[PDB]
Amino acid sequence: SISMTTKLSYGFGAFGKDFAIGIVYMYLMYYYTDVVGLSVGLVGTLFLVARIWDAINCPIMGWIVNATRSRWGKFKPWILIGTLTNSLVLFLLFSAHLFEGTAQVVFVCVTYILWGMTYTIMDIPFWSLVPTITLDKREREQLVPFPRFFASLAGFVTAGITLPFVSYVGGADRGFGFQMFTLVLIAFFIASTIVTLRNVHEVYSSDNGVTAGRPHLTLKTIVGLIYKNDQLSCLLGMALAYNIASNIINGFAIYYFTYVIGDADLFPYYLSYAGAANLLTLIVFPRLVKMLSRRILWAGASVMPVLSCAGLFAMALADIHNAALIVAAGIFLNIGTALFWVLQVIMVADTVDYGEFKLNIRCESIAYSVQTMVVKGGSAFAAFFIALVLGLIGYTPNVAQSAQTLQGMQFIMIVLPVLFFMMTLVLYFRYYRLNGDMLRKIQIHLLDKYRKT
């Protein structure tokens, strides 16, 4: 079985990894607009351009991680480099409050794109370690929940106690408190990286003496492996659909809590119940996956946010506000995302295994590069589709609009995510085959194929 030590160390590693980025994802816009003073248009354009650049750079980082030969392994050195460089670039990122003028703009842009690229460096190989630790069904099912739960935790802990820290430490100079809390984040991140590097011991590694991995590969060969691996491409499409849907829903929630009718002090209860739901569904996943199926749990992951969408649709039609429905939709969305993330990690592992099975090539870095680039392109395409819908309905001026036009915009924003969820779940049910007997077949085939000359 998997060493409990390795389980908890991977959990702590994921905790640090996601704790280093929660502050960014959650308050970088607030810092750049409320502490630095940059035009919202500039911030948004930078965010979108940088996410596009990261999605493009992802396969490049995968090719880098696959062709690297080193003592600690082919994932551990890039993990260490990424963690260190990302900590440094994060401190620089939130030290932007010092400069002014064109110098400040250049500093902000450079630091932001550097932070993104560094986090890619770190992220791809970290999750690429999963298929190395184990290539068994239930072992993966009861391993992944640890890092997923710890990442979700880190995020909610940020959401909860990031602002009190900044207020307590130089509450007047908000930039100072931000860059100070950055130190806490960096300490946790480096401690987690060290813990995971020492304790997590990769098995069945690609560069291992006998695992059917070719270190010398081209960018064309590797990237085309994604379509050659029909299951990996199916996973790509499913994750892209799910990510577009979840990003649209999360933007809707951010808009309904940040600007409109979010001043009832309702957000604390919503976030608390959301985190409770996510953490509880992650904790009991090892038992849910067995009580129910894997296919059933994926259907649920895509359907629970659909039920939340239906609920908030009934809301937007009947009552503009109702706290109970709001927290219920939050709980549904959070359970769905938890199930989705756990299954998605386990499934990219299954896909690297099926790639070794069919194509006779073991490449984890590429599958998890697909994971990361899809995570980015999801936000990118959500923004694209939202802008498309807005320009279509006539919101291109954004100066004055009919109330009925706003209600229609609301309804379309509620209905598009369910379209994407239907896409992801039907694609899964019609083209995905790595389950049950197929997984065991691939497992036995690989166990047998591991034979030196």
Domains of the chain from N-terminus onward:
4-449 (1.20.1250.20)
5-20: buried (b, 16+ CB within 10 Å) or exposed (e) per residue? ebbebbbbbbbbbbbb
Determination method here?
X-ray
Tokens 């996956």 correspond to 289
Whether the Cβ atoms of residue 358 and residue 229 lie closer than 8 Å to each other: yes
Q: How far apart are CA 253 and CA 331, in angstroms?
A: 13
Instruction: Indicate the resolution in Å.
Output: 3.2
Tokens 């602002």 correspond to 163
Residue 299 class from Cβ within 10 Å (0-12 exposed, 13-18 middle, 19+ buried)?
A: middle
Whether the Cβ atoms of residue 129 and residue 7 lie closer than 8 Å to each other: no
401 Cβ contact list (under 8 Å, min separation 6)? 394, 395
Residue 127 assigned as binding residue = yes
Q: How far apart are CA 193 and CA 126, in angstroms?
A: 9
Tokens 């090892």 correspond to 286
**What CA dihedral angle connects 18, 122, 58 and 52, to 10 degrees?**
50
Residue 440 assigned as binding residue = no
Residue 148 assigned as binding residue = yes
Q: How far apart are CA 9 and CA 286, in angstroms?
A: 18
